Structures are given as structure tokens and as C-alpha cells.
Amino acid sequence: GSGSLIWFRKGLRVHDNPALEYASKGSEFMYPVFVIDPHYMESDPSAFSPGSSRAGVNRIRFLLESLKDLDSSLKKLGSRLLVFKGEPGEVLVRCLQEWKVKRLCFEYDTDPYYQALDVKVKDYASSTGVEVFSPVSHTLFNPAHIIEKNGGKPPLSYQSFLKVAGEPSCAKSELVMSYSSLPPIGDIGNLGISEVPSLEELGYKDDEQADWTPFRGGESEALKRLTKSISDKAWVANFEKPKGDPSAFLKPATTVMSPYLKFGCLSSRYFYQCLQNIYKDVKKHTSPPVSLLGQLLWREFFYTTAFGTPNFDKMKGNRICKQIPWNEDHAMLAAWRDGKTGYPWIDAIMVQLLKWGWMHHLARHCVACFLTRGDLFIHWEQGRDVFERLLIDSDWAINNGNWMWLSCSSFFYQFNRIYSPISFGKKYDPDGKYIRHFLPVLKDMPKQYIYEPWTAPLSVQTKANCIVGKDYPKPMVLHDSASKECKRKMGEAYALNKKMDGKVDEENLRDLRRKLQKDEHE
Template identity: 80%
Template structure:
């Protein structure tokens, strides 16, 4: 598959392809943050611009098939996550079109593609959501360097998390807080929480002339080269519209929100899961964690009593921010070696045991059922993740947490660098938590 993705002519559906001939323009580079609501980068890109290029770059390493991988998907991502991403892009494109714009899909190594767009389109601003993930940090340095040298303003706000991890680390004397309670103390109330977030936009400036850049519509799984692969039915559809619908449903039950108490809840409840299943939407930024938090605060204000962090629903979002902060401030956070937070443990290395765990062949029905759910749906309840991570590491097989982390990283739809590594460090007793048993787990 190569060219099915790319139209060699300028994009169709541009309102006026020659719009960019004069005036000031900006690029809105979508990576995560696949939403219209609470998107400060998009807001800034639109402000004072005659035209805006909303861009998403398909990185072949992330999207195109790798026949050598242990499950259908690319080198870096399982097919469920790729499909969820494509659905999210289609939804974003639909929303942009309603606002008089559209999503421009380009293909290639994102740094090179972006640099080429910056050269070709003569824009004055480049806007994208800040990302603490090391992959994006390295990419952003390259793109920013080019933009700055070319006199292009770069606006890259922190909006994926409730807080700016760098601020918290600075407040703690340059080190990340290592306990949830110390994190809460340092964090306080989010600075943006005193005024309501911008959650709707009535229109966007039109898209400009794309010159000779190859633009396409959002591809399908088939376009990406996966042929007619049979797709499992998955209960979670990607996209901002679905995220907002799911959020609305969750918070409409005020009593449920007020009484939410992790880790209580049935990890094997499938028809109506015991938690929100908003993690895939938060991962791709189809849902703003800030908007989610604001909605929860609104519920809390209108009930007589409610649970509190760490067990409340707002407390779960704070766990997310906690791991983002520690991960951002810890060199080699995703490794045992060279990671100051991580206990150095002589894990066993056994490919057969690892494969049995990964392929749901351990013979322990509970463990195997969870691994089947991971492969089929790409999402499991938190306590189910606890069970299989504990089983692989300290609990039974005594295999390296990095091996299990890799399997989750590929197969989870919500796979998130900071949260996944943080939880594997936790569950393997390599960091944060060192008890062999946990009472809530023993119930299952």
C-alpha cells in the first residue's frame, strides 16, 4: 500500500483552495488532542488568522501493517488502537467540516512532513498541544528549531493534563513528588479551574492553498494495507462525539459519581463496566481531562456528600496527572536500568512463559480471560490489569515488568507512556508500592 492514501492533487473539499494566497495563516498540528472542545492550541491557531491548516500526519511506523508483529497491527500499535484512532480522525474531520474547515491528512515521517508544510504554506503560527511523551519531546525540538529559525511563532500549550508537570516539579525543588499525597499538596487547585473552559466554537477560518503537499481524506483500515481483515466487534468507538456522549452518560448518574470508590467495583462487569471507560478517549485527547474534571466538580457541588481522592472519580484523574508528573521528571522512567526510582530485581527471562501469558494459555481461567479481553477489546478494568500484571511479575511467573509493559503498550487502546509504565512499576513492586498482597485484590 502506498498511494491509496495520497491524492497528488490539492485537497478536495477545501472551501476556497486559493484562500492562502495572501493574509496570515497558521497550522494546527493535531497529534493527540483530537477534539474541538477545550483545545487552546486550536483556539489560538484561529485567532487573528485568515486561514488555518488543521493537519494530521500518518506516521507509517505507527499505522501501517507489520507482518512480523505478534498481533495484527503496525510495528508500534495493535489494530484496535489504529482503528480507534482512524475513527477519532473521521469524527474530528466531520466536526471541522461543520465549522467550515476540514482535516488535512498527510503521510510520512512527521518531522519532515511538518517542516515541508511550514516551508510551503508560508504560515505565521504553528500550534500544537504540548506532549510530555519522550517520542514527542524529541520530535517537537526538531520542528520548533526549524520554525523558530524561519521566524514562525510556535504555540504549544499544556492541555493534555490538569496541571503542567514542569510547574509541579519546579515547586518541588526540581524533583517530581513520589507520593500521591505529596503530589496533591503541591498541585492544589488547577489554575484554570476558576473560569469555565471554552467548550464550543461557532466557526473556523477556511483552509488555505495546500500547494504541492499531498493531502488525503482519513484512510480506512483497508487503505492502510490491512486488506479485508476481519474486525472484532468492540464496544468503544473512537472520537470526540462518542467521548462526550459517554461522559454525559457517566455524569448523568450523580449518585454513581458521588459514591464512586476505587478499587470497589466489579472488574468482570462487561455489559455495563464498573468504571467510565473514558481512558481511550483521554489517551487520544478526544476528551479533555480538564473538561472531565470540571464536569465532576459540577456534580460534587450539587450533592450532599461525595468520595474524595485517591478513591473518587476526580481522584482517578489526579492519579493520571501524578504519573505524568513523575514520568516527566524521571530519566529512563520506562526502564529498570538507569531508573533511580526502580528497584533492580533479577527477573527471570522465559519466552515460553511470556508467550503463554500473552496468548491466554496459563491455565488460570481468570488470568486467561483477562488476556483474551485485552486482545479482543484493548481495554480491561483496572483490577483486571492489576491481576495479570501481578501474575506476570512478583505474583507468579517472576518475569520482567518491561516485557508485560510492552504487551500492554501494543494491545491497549488507551496505551499511555506515562500511565502504563507507572502502573507496571507499581504492580511489579519496583517502585511506589512494595507490599506483596493487597487486600482489595485478594477478594477476586
């Protein structure tokens, strides 16, 4: 008889799943599918840290966990999760041509990877008589609608986006959070049926599995943590993003729902709905941009902008990105990536990236600034790539948008507002608790130098059992001069961008790069 297939990619959850719902109705049997793409999941010995070439082992373990939770939640309703390994496009059509499937459902998505897959699968299904339901539930708004309504392009600013965006449909909507039951799986036919694969099966040695980010994945954890994240009504009511403490690691200054919203473990519509409820239950609460709900709106802003901008994930070809002659220097990038820059604050943060796969927004700010238009002047696409595989909440739209923001390549252009690798952390942690924790090599350094070990008298060092240049590196660069040179180049780069009416050529750029080379080398 007529069967259905619920294809899972990002909505790794049972609650608020418009796609899963439809797949359960009018079907005597249902096929829940998820494909492990070797290219993204399997071990890559060439990578700079355990994982594939696109994902650190941390985000991978998170996904695998989300998958187990999901299957489990399905095995509860009498269903199950069928996991195949291979190129999704191939796997999917081979599933269609193998099963009596008349209806194919999967949550919509705007990432390039998925836009590409969905054209193929859609065309195959359409040409083979399979119905296709691809509802928008990963975001509160439909990028295409916003862009269409706004004329022909995406609103140029948060403020402008909210005006146009209006309010999400899920507002007065009633979401489906549970199901009494779910259609039985149905003939598995002849396909390599598989259970969620272990890190080992993905090719990872045990030493590559020693560390553990402190955040389990899955819808279960998701919902549980949301409950904890917003239990304090006053806190959520008085929420102001800029006022959070970036050094607070024992108790993160924000929700950390980031990874669950990225893999769809948590519906953002439900979250948005909860916030709404507790907002009306008080009377006085913060509003965007700084509000907690205002944060779900930043996600919306970048997604819409990302979906409407070709070459969004790169400078060249990007309508909205300022053309800047960034340097390239695997040695400098490496020093920053592994957290060996010399500035304890920056290094401590980069280590939290590697160990937690998450850092407070402001921390992400500092290291992104230091790496680009703040001190090193390395291409933002480079910090972007490092972040993309290390963050357990790595999100295409969000990550690219933010790196362009922190590099003053787009959205924000007050490049003379530079974070200080030395003094910023003090504003919150003068004792340097955060640093000591993630950089135990400086465990004993006296607070008078914790943010600048290179200024600690040689005697203090040896006693603190930390010698700059041996145990802990010395400043890879001197902030003052560095940031002053960045502010300089940044100036002439903007000058060129303005002179060429936002259309700098491959030529001009090259000539600027040369020009700056002279004025800053001889």
C-alpha cells in the same frame, strides 16, 4: 497573508482546545494537520496479533475513527483535516516551507516521542520566523511547574503530589467548547493532500478487521459517553475505585473514558470541571484517592512523575526503579500474552485485553501481578510492551508507571500482597460468568471448577466438553510454590537494592541473578 497551522497529535477534539482557538484568531486561513506515522500505523506481519509493532489494530481503528470525527467536526465549521503520511518532523517542516504560515500551534505533550519532535519543530519554526503556541491542555497540571515547585524532583507520592500540585488553573476557568466558525483552509500548495486512511490502506487484510472493540473513537462519542458515564449523580458522588467489580463486563464498573482521555478526544479539564459541578450539587461525595475526580489525579501523578524521570520506561537507568533480576522466557510470556496460562481468571482477562483493548483496573492488576512478582517473574517491561500495543487506551506515562507499581519496582513495595489467580475472581463472580464469556471453551464447566478446571474430575471435564491439556491448557505454574519463590527472590533483590543505597550495579545485579539461579535450581 499571515496564515496559521494547528498541528494535531493528542488533542483530537474541538472543545477546550487552547491551541485551536489561537490558530483561528487573527488568521485569514488555517491549516489543520495530522500525520500518520507509518512506523506506528502500518501493518507488521511479524507482530503477534494484527497491527503495527507498537499498536494493535484495535487502537489503530480507534485513532482513525477519532480522526474522521475530528475532520467531520472541522468540515462542519467550514474547515477540514489534512492528513499526511510520513515522519511528522519531515512532514511538518515541508508544510511550513510550503505554506504562508506565520503561526504554528499544537497542544503540548510530555511523551518522549513528542518531546523529541517538538524540539526539532520548535527550533525550525524559531529559526524561520514562525510563531509557536504550545499550551498545556492534555493534563490538568504542568509537570515542569510541579517539579520546579517541589524543589527539583517530582513528588514521591500521590498524597505529596496533590499537596504540591494544589488545584488546576482550569478550576475557575471558562473553557471554549465551540466555535461559530473557523478560518478557511487556504492554498494547499503542492503536497500530497490526503483524507483519513482506511485500515486496508494501512495494509490490513479483512480477516485482521473481523473483530471490533466495543468502543468507537472520536470527540463526539467521547462527550456522549461522558454524559452517560456521569448521569447518575449519586453513583459519581459515591465513587470508590477499589470497590469496583472487575468481572462486570456487560456494564463496566467504571467510566471507560480511558481511551478518549488518552487520544485527547475528551478534554480532561472539562471532565474535571463537570465532576466539580456535580460535587457541589450534592454535598456528600468521595474524595481522592478513591474518588472519580481522584482518578483524573492518578493520571496527573504518573504524568508528572514520568516527565521528571529519565529512562522512566525501563528498569536500567531508572532512578526510581528497583533493580530486579527478572527472568526472560518467550514461552512463558507467550502463554500469558495469548491467555493460555491455565488459570481461567487470568486467561479470561488477557482475552478481554485482546478483544476489548480495555479491562477494569483490578483485572489489569491481577494479570500484571501474575506476570511479574506474583507467579511467573517475567520482566515488567514485557507485560508493559504487551499492554502498550493491545490497550486501546495505551498511555506511556500511565502504563509504565502502573507496571512499575504492580511489579513492586516503584511506588508500592508490599510485594507480599499477592493476588490469587484462583480465588480473587470468586470474590465477585463465583458462578464464573466473566470467564465463561471470554473463555467459551469452559462454557459448560460446573462452577465448582470454573476457576480451576485442572481439579475437575476427568469425568466432569469430558462431560463439560473441555479436557485440560487438550482443549484448555493446564496451570503453567502452581501458584503457591511460584508466588513463594517470587516473594523469596523479591526479598533478596530488595536486600541488594538497600545494601547498595538504591544504586545496584550492572555487576551486582548479574551476580544476584546467578546466585538466585543456584539456590532455585539446585
